[PDB]
Amino acid sequence: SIIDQNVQALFNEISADAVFVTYDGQNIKKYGTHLDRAKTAYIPASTFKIANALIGLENHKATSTEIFKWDGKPRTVPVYQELARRIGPSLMQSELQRIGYGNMQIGTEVDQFWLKGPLTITPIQEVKFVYDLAQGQLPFKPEVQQQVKEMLYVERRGENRLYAKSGWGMAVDPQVGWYVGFVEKADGQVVAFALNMQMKAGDDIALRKQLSLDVLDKLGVFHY
Protein backbone atom coordinates (compact mmCIF):
# COMPACT_ATOMS: atom_id res chain seq x y z
CA SER A 1 0.00 0.00 0.00
CA ILE A 2 2.56 2.59 1.20
CA ILE A 3 5.04 1.56 -1.57
CA ASP A 4 2.31 1.71 -4.24
CA GLN A 5 1.23 5.07 -2.79
CA ASN A 6 4.82 6.38 -2.80
CA VAL A 7 5.17 5.36 -6.49
CA GLN A 8 1.87 7.12 -7.30
CA ALA A 9 3.23 10.24 -5.56
CA LEU A 10 6.18 10.17 -8.02
CA PHE A 11 3.92 10.56 -11.06
CA ASN A 12 2.67 13.91 -9.66
CA GLU A 13 6.14 15.40 -10.36
CA ILE A 14 5.86 15.09 -14.19
CA SER A 15 2.99 16.07 -16.50
CA ALA A 16 3.47 13.21 -19.01
CA ASP A 17 0.60 10.90 -19.96
CA ALA A 18 2.01 7.52 -18.81
CA VAL A 19 1.65 4.01 -17.39
CA PHE A 20 4.13 1.61 -15.79
CA VAL A 21 3.11 -2.05 -15.75
CA THR A 22 4.91 -4.73 -13.73
CA TYR A 23 4.49 -8.48 -13.96
CA ASP A 24 5.99 -11.11 -11.62
CA GLY A 25 4.43 -14.25 -13.17
CA GLN A 26 1.21 -13.86 -11.14
CA ASN A 27 -0.09 -10.29 -10.92
CA ILE A 28 -0.23 -7.32 -13.22
CA LYS A 29 0.18 -4.05 -11.35
CA LYS A 30 -0.36 -0.64 -12.96
CA TYR A 31 1.01 2.76 -11.92
CA GLY A 32 1.10 6.17 -13.59
CA THR A 33 -0.89 9.17 -14.75
CA HIS A 34 -3.13 7.36 -17.28
CA LEU A 35 -3.76 3.70 -16.38
CA ASP A 36 -5.90 3.12 -19.48
CA ARG A 37 -2.63 3.11 -21.47
CA ALA A 38 -1.85 -0.41 -20.06
CA LYS A 39 -4.51 -2.07 -22.21
CA THR A 40 -4.17 0.31 -25.17
CA ALA A 41 -2.32 -1.00 -28.23
CA TYR A 42 0.64 0.94 -29.65
CA ILE A 43 3.35 0.33 -32.22
CA PRO A 44 6.32 -1.47 -30.58
CA ALA A 45 8.94 0.68 -32.38
CA SER A 46 12.43 -0.63 -31.43
CA THR A 47 10.95 -2.80 -28.62
CA PHE A 48 10.32 -5.04 -31.65
CA LYS A 49 14.03 -5.75 -31.69
CA ILE A 50 13.24 -8.45 -29.01
CA ALA A 51 10.99 -10.42 -31.34
CA ASN A 52 13.13 -9.74 -34.46
CA ALA A 53 16.29 -11.13 -32.89
CA LEU A 54 14.51 -14.25 -31.56
CA ILE A 55 12.84 -14.98 -34.87
CA GLY A 56 16.07 -14.28 -36.80
CA LEU A 57 18.15 -16.62 -34.63
CA GLU A 58 15.52 -19.40 -34.46
CA ASN A 59 15.18 -19.47 -38.28
CA HIS A 60 18.95 -19.22 -38.94
CA LYS A 61 18.83 -15.80 -40.62
CA ALA A 62 21.66 -14.56 -38.36
CA THR A 63 23.98 -15.72 -35.59
CA SER A 64 24.05 -13.94 -32.21
CA THR A 65 27.66 -12.90 -32.85
CA GLU A 66 26.44 -11.15 -36.02
CA ILE A 67 23.62 -9.39 -34.17
CA PHE A 68 25.75 -8.42 -31.15
CA LYS A 69 28.37 -7.03 -33.58
CA TRP A 70 25.82 -5.01 -35.58
CA ASP A 71 24.35 -3.65 -32.32
CA GLY A 72 27.76 -2.41 -31.08
CA LYS A 73 28.86 -0.31 -34.09
CA PRO A 74 29.85 3.38 -33.55
CA ARG A 75 26.31 4.78 -33.16
CA THR A 76 19.64 3.67 -30.61
CA VAL A 77 19.80 0.71 -30.87
CA PRO A 78 17.36 0.10 -33.76
CA VAL A 79 15.86 -3.13 -35.13
CA TYR A 80 18.40 -4.87 -37.41
CA GLN A 81 16.54 -4.10 -40.59
CA GLU A 82 18.56 -6.41 -42.86
CA LEU A 83 17.68 -9.30 -40.53
CA ALA A 84 13.96 -8.45 -40.70
CA ARG A 85 14.33 -8.52 -44.47
CA ARG A 86 16.12 -11.92 -44.38
CA ILE A 87 13.22 -13.28 -42.30
CA GLY A 88 10.89 -11.73 -44.89
CA PRO A 89 7.13 -11.00 -44.67
CA SER A 90 5.84 -14.57 -45.07
CA LEU A 91 7.96 -16.02 -42.26
CA MET A 92 7.69 -12.93 -40.03
CA GLN A 93 3.89 -13.07 -40.26
CA SER A 94 3.67 -16.78 -39.44
CA GLU A 95 6.24 -16.50 -36.62
CA LEU A 96 4.47 -13.55 -35.01
CA GLN A 97 1.18 -15.50 -35.17
CA ARG A 98 2.94 -18.61 -33.79
CA ILE A 99 4.32 -16.69 -30.78
CA GLY A 100 1.25 -14.44 -30.25
CA TYR A 101 2.99 -11.06 -30.51
CA GLY A 102 0.71 -8.06 -30.13
CA ASN A 103 -1.93 -7.99 -32.85
CA MET A 104 0.35 -10.18 -35.07
CA GLN A 105 -0.31 -8.02 -38.17
CA ILE A 106 2.57 -6.74 -40.32
CA GLY A 107 0.57 -5.71 -43.41
CA THR A 108 1.68 -6.68 -46.92
CA GLU A 109 5.16 -5.61 -48.09
CA VAL A 110 5.50 -3.12 -45.22
CA ASP A 111 9.24 -2.47 -44.75
CA GLN A 112 9.27 -1.18 -41.13
CA PHE A 113 5.90 -2.30 -39.75
CA TRP A 114 7.22 -1.90 -36.15
CA LEU A 115 7.64 1.85 -36.90
CA LYS A 116 4.61 2.56 -39.16
CA GLY A 117 2.04 -0.04 -38.13
CA PRO A 118 0.04 -2.08 -38.66
CA LEU A 119 1.76 -4.04 -35.87
CA THR A 120 0.70 -3.00 -32.36
CA ILE A 121 0.98 -4.35 -28.82
CA THR A 122 -0.28 -3.40 -25.35
CA PRO A 123 2.04 -2.70 -22.42
CA ILE A 124 0.42 -5.69 -20.65
CA GLN A 125 1.35 -7.86 -23.64
CA GLU A 126 4.84 -6.36 -23.65
CA VAL A 127 5.52 -7.05 -19.96
CA LYS A 128 4.25 -10.68 -20.19
CA PHE A 129 6.35 -11.28 -23.34
CA VAL A 130 9.68 -10.26 -21.79
CA TYR A 131 8.71 -12.15 -18.62
CA ASP A 132 8.27 -15.27 -20.78
CA LEU A 133 11.66 -14.44 -22.38
CA ALA A 134 13.30 -13.95 -18.99
CA GLN A 135 12.03 -17.38 -17.83
CA GLY A 136 12.71 -19.28 -21.10
CA GLN A 137 8.94 -19.73 -21.53
CA LEU A 138 8.63 -18.56 -25.16
CA PRO A 139 8.54 -21.23 -27.91
CA PHE A 140 12.18 -20.75 -28.95
CA LYS A 141 15.47 -22.59 -28.34
CA PRO A 142 16.50 -21.88 -24.72
CA GLU A 143 19.95 -20.82 -26.04
CA VAL A 144 18.25 -18.30 -28.36
CA GLN A 145 16.22 -16.85 -25.51
CA GLN A 146 19.40 -16.56 -23.37
CA GLN A 147 21.35 -14.80 -26.13
CA VAL A 148 18.48 -12.32 -26.72
CA LYS A 149 18.31 -11.83 -22.93
CA GLU A 150 22.00 -10.81 -22.91
CA MET A 151 21.55 -8.36 -25.80
CA LEU A 152 19.20 -6.45 -23.41
CA TYR A 153 21.53 -6.52 -20.40
CA VAL A 154 22.00 -3.01 -18.94
CA GLU A 155 23.27 -3.26 -15.39
CA ARG A 156 23.96 -5.32 -12.32
CA ARG A 157 23.41 -4.23 -8.69
CA GLY A 158 24.69 -7.05 -6.50
CA GLU A 159 23.43 -10.05 -8.49
CA ASN A 160 20.19 -8.18 -9.32
CA ARG A 161 20.41 -7.83 -13.12
CA LEU A 162 18.55 -5.16 -15.13
CA TYR A 163 17.54 -5.84 -18.70
CA ALA A 164 15.78 -3.27 -20.90
CA LYS A 165 14.85 -2.04 -24.37
CA SER A 166 13.75 1.51 -25.24
CA GLY A 167 11.38 2.48 -28.04
CA TRP A 168 10.22 5.74 -29.52
CA GLY A 169 7.57 5.77 -32.27
CA MET A 170 8.15 9.13 -33.96
CA ALA A 171 5.99 8.33 -37.04
CA VAL A 172 2.68 7.80 -35.17
CA ASP A 173 0.74 10.74 -33.74
CA PRO A 174 0.59 10.89 -30.80
CA GLN A 175 4.15 9.60 -30.49
CA VAL A 176 4.83 6.72 -28.17
CA GLY A 177 7.73 6.05 -25.84
CA TRP A 178 8.64 2.64 -24.49
CA TYR A 179 11.00 1.34 -21.82
CA VAL A 180 10.37 -2.36 -21.52
CA GLY A 181 12.37 -4.96 -19.61
CA PHE A 182 12.90 -7.00 -16.49
CA VAL A 183 14.98 -7.35 -13.35
CA GLU A 184 16.24 -10.86 -12.60
CA LYS A 185 16.81 -11.08 -8.85
CA ALA A 186 19.77 -12.78 -7.17
CA ASP A 187 17.53 -15.52 -5.68
CA GLY A 188 16.01 -16.24 -9.16
CA GLN A 189 12.73 -14.28 -8.98
CA VAL A 190 11.81 -12.01 -11.94
CA VAL A 191 9.90 -8.72 -12.16
CA ALA A 192 9.08 -7.65 -15.72
CA PHE A 193 8.12 -4.02 -16.44
CA ALA A 194 6.87 -1.69 -19.16
CA LEU A 195 6.94 2.08 -19.26
CA ASN A 196 4.51 3.38 -21.87
CA MET A 197 4.12 7.12 -22.28
CA GLN A 198 3.16 9.77 -24.81
CA MET A 199 6.25 11.45 -26.29
CA LYS A 200 6.75 14.88 -27.89
CA ALA A 201 9.40 16.11 -30.33
CA GLY A 202 12.23 17.73 -28.34
CA ASP A 203 11.63 15.57 -25.25
CA ASP A 204 14.65 14.42 -23.28
CA ILE A 205 15.97 11.12 -24.74
CA ALA A 206 16.96 9.91 -21.23
CA LEU A 207 13.61 10.38 -19.44
CA ARG A 208 12.08 6.96 -20.19
CA LYS A 209 15.06 5.25 -18.60
CA GLN A 210 15.32 7.64 -15.70
CA LEU A 211 11.59 7.50 -14.88
CA SER A 212 11.60 3.68 -15.07
CA LEU A 213 14.65 3.40 -12.75
CA ASP A 214 13.03 5.76 -10.24
CA VAL A 215 9.88 3.57 -10.21
CA LEU A 216 11.95 0.38 -9.86
CA ASP A 217 13.81 2.04 -6.97
CA LYS A 218 10.58 3.09 -5.19
CA LEU A 219 9.19 -0.43 -5.80
CA GLY A 220 12.27 -2.01 -4.12
CA VAL A 221 12.92 -4.05 -7.28
CA PHE A 222 16.22 -2.44 -8.36
CA HIS A 223 18.43 0.30 -6.83
CA TYR A 224 20.44 1.91 -9.70
- Could you give the domains of the chain? 1-224 (3.40.710.10)
Q: Choosing from 46, 64, 90, 166, which is the catalytic residue?
A: 46
Is 46 one of the annotated active-site residues of the chain? yes
Cα torsion through 169, 18, 93, 85, rounded to 10: 30
Euclidean distance between CA atoms 42 and 21, whole angstroms: 14
Resolution number, Å: 2.2
